[PDB]
């Protein structure tokens, strides 16, 4: 009960993200843009964290 | 229609310059933009 | 609970990277991660602190 939740992700001095933060949704955190927008870089930042 | 609206607006607004406060290290807040609970996180676009 | 990793581009012919994990507990709910890691120096663009 009362499962813990990821609330925020932060990328510092990353290519395309100097001081970026994403507020992580409880169910659906969808990140979208043009191709090559660093989207893969965002998932990479999370996973390497 | 509001969601369909918002995307269309954003896809336009963001292309015009970028927000300078984004690099201050201070996250923007989720300003409400209508009833029913819709919110937008956005720094003020300043540098065109 | 905040968790995180420091990263650094290791100089060399091969594009290497060095990583260091860390954790923080008891942080005030108000303070955002960016503030802790970034120094809002008088310059337009904030610094990132080791």
């Amino acid at each position: 009960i009362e499962r813990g939740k990821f609330r925020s992700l932060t990328l510092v001095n990353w290519n395309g993200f100097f001081a970026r933060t994403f507020d992580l949704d409880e169910l659906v955190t969808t990140l979208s843009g043009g191709n090559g927008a660093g989207k893969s870089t965002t998932m990479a930042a999370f996973v390497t964290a | 229609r509001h969601f369909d609206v918002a995307r269309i607006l954003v896809d336009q607004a963001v292309r015009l310059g970028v927000a300078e406060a984004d690099f201050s290290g201070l996250p923007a807040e989720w300003l409400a933009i209508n009833d029913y609970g819709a919110k937008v996180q956005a720094h003020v676009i300043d540098t065109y | 609970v905040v968790v995180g990793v420091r990263l650094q581009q290791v100089a060399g012919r091969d594009r290497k990277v060095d990583i260091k994990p860390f954790m923080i507990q008891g942080l005030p709910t108000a303070i955002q991660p960016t503030q802790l890691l970034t120094e809002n120096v008088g310059e337009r663009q904030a610094r990132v602190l080791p």
Side-chain angles (χ1 to χ4, degrees), chain C residues 26-50:
Chain C
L27 287 164
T29 58
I31 193 149
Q32 308 285 18
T34 50
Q35 303 167 297
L36 300 168
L37 271 53
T38 59
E39 312 196 67
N40 193 269
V41 286
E43 278 280 28
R44 174 268 306 296
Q45 181 162 357
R47 191 182 93 110
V48 299
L49 61 83

Side-chain angles (χ1 to χ4, degrees), chain A residues 2 4-5 7-8 15-16 19-20 22-23 26 28 32 36 39 41-42 44 46-47 49:
Chain A
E2 185 63 26
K5 289 109 183 181
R7 305 324 302 124
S8 69
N15 178 291
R20 179 63 59 246
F22 305 97
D23 192 90
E26 293 76 1
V28 177
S32 183
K39 190 178 76 174
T41 305
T42 73
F46 180 95
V47 301

Side-chain angles (χ1 to χ4, degrees), chain A residues 1-22:
Chain A
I1 293 294
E2 185 63 26
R3 198 159 290 280
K5 289 109 183 181
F6 298 95
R7 305 324 302 124
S8 69
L9 167 66
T10 305
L11 290 77
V12 182
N13 197 30
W14 281 72
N15 178 291
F17 303 106
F18 196 88
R20 179 63 59 246
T21 298
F22 305 97

Side-chain angles (χ1 to χ4, degrees), chain C:
Chain C
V1 59
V2 167
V3 64
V5 292
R6 173 277 210 183
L7 281 76
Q8 187 276 332
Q9 287 174 341
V10 179
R13 307 304 294 262
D14 297 351
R15 288 165 186 247
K16 300 173 184 292
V17 175
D18 168 41
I19 184 156
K20 186 161 280 285
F22 62 79
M23 183 278 288
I24 322 173
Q25 182 58 42
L27 287 164
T29 58
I31 193 149
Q32 308 285 18
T34 50
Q35 303 167 297
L36 300 168
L37 271 53
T38 59
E39 312 196 67
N40 193 269
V41 286
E43 278 280 28
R44 174 268 306 296
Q45 181 162 357
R47 191 182 93 110
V48 299
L49 61 83

